[PDB]
Amino acid sequence: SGFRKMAFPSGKVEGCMVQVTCGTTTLNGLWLDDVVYCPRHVICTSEDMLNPNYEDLLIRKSNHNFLVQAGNVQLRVIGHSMQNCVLKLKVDTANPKTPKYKFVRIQPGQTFSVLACYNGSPSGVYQCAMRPNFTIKGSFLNGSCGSVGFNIDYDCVSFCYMHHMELPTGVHAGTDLEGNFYGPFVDRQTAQAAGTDTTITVNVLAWLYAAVINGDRWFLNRFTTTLNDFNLVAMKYNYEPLTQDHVDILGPLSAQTGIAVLDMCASLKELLQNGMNGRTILGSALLEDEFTPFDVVRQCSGVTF
C-alpha cells in the first residue's frame, strides 16, 4: 500500500555526473563513454548571453579552456563540438561507470527523474513531468545547469532532459540530449515566457486508478460518458484532450480495477464540475497529473532496476 511520487534509482546516472568549468561559468556535464555533454551556454559571458553567436564563441575556445572534473580527477578535453544547444567535449578517458544508455526525446505528459547537481555532485533526485507547455516544474538553484532527466527501462538509462535555464515564473526549460529544446525556448537572454499550461488528463486518470488500487473509492460513480463528451468537458477546464491511444494505454488499469476508462472519465468530469467537497484522494486535495499510466503500473507492481 501507499502511493508516493517516486523517482528511478539514480545510481547509474550519478556515475556520469562531472563538473564543467569554462571561464567564470561552472555547471554540470554528463560523461558517457569518451564524451562530456553540457549546455552550450557554458561558453557565454554576461555580454555574450544577450545575443550569442555560439559558432563564433566556440571557434575561439581551445580544449584547455574547458576544465572538466570527475570527482577529484581532472579529465583532459581532446576535442569540442556543438550539437544544437548542447556542447560535446571529447575526453581522453572513457567513463568506466558508463551504463547501458539511449538518448530519447519525450512528449508532454511523460514523466522522468531529475538528478539535480551542483559542481558535478548530485544533491537530490525527484520525479517530474514534461508539462504540456514544454516546461518542467523542477526545483533548481543557480549552478544546476547540465542536471539531467532520465527514465530506466530494464537495465538501460534513457536520457531525456538536460537543464538549461529558469523562466521568470520559476518553471524550467531545457533540451533533449541532442540539444533540441523542449518548447519554443532559446538559450539567449531575451523575454521568454512559458505558455498557459494544461492538466495532463491521461495521468490524472492513471492516478485515479492508483487511488482505487489503494482503497480510495469515494469518487467513483455509476456513470459513463462518450470520449467526445468527456473531451468537450475537459477542454473547458484546461485539460488536455484524451485520445483513443490514452484510453488503450489505461486498459490494464481498467482491467485490474474493474472501472472502464469512460467510467473513470465520468468520475473526473464530476470532480471537475463539483470539486472534492473536503475529501482527499491519495492524501491530495488536487488532482495529481505527474504519474503516467506506466508509472502507476510500475509502482503498484514493484518492477525492479
Ligand X SMILES: COCCO[C@H](C(=O)Nc1cncc2ccccc12)c1ccc(Cl)c(Cl)c1
DSSP states along 225-238: --HHHHHHHHHHTT
For residue 41, indicate whether it is catalytic.
yes
Select from 65-73, 161-169, 196-204, 210-218 the region that touches ligand X (CB under 6 A). Answer: 161-169
Q: Are 284 and 271 in contact (CB under 8 A)?
A: no
How far apart, in whole angstroms, are the C-alpha atoms of residue 297 and residue 91?
40
Is residue 272 within the footprint of ligand X (CB under 6 A)?
Answer: no
Select from 74-82, 86-94, 162-170, 208-216 the region that touches ligand X (CB under 6 A). Answer: 162-170
Determine which one of 16, 41, 164, 246 is catalytic: 41
Q: Which residues contact 215 (CB under 8 A, 6 or more apart)?
A: 1
Helix 201-213 to helix 261-274 angle (10° resolution) is 100
Is residue 284 within the footprint of a second copy (CB under 8 A)?
Answer: yes
Interface with a second copy (CB under 8 A), residue from 71, 79, 170, 184: 170
Cell digits of residue 301: 507492481
Q: Which of 144, 162, 168 is nearest to 85 (CA)?
A: 162
For residue 145, indicate whether it is catalytic.
yes
* Phi, psi of 294, deg, nearest 5: -70, -40
Residue (49 or 58) nearer to ligand X, CB: 49
Interface with a second copy (CB under 8 A), residue from 15, 99, 241, 252: 15
Minimal distance, residue 155 CB to a second copy, in Å: 9
C-alpha dist (Å) from residue 222 to 53, 143, 210, 217: 60, 52, 19, 12
Q: Are 153 and 104 in contact (CB under 8 A)?
A: no
Q: Which of 17, 57, 16 is nearest to 187 (CA)?
A: 57
Minimal distance, residue 233 CB to a second copy, in Å: 20
Restricting to residues 38-97, name those near a second copy by CB under 8 A.
none
Determine which one of 44, 128, 145, 265 is catalytic: 145
How far apart, in whole angstroms, are the C-alpha atoms of residue 269 and residue 263?
10
Residue (77 or 288) nearer to a second copy, CB: 288
Residues annotated as catalytic (active site), given as ranges: 41, 145
> Can you give the binding site for a second copy, defined by CB under 8 A?
1-12, 14-15, 115-119, 121-128, 137-141, 143-144, 166, 170-172, 214-215, 280, 283-286, 298-305
> Can you give the binding site for ligand X, defined by CB under 6 A?
1, 25, 27, 41, 49, 140-145, 164-166, 172, 187-189
> Can you give the binding site for Cl ion, defined by CB under 5 A?
6, 124
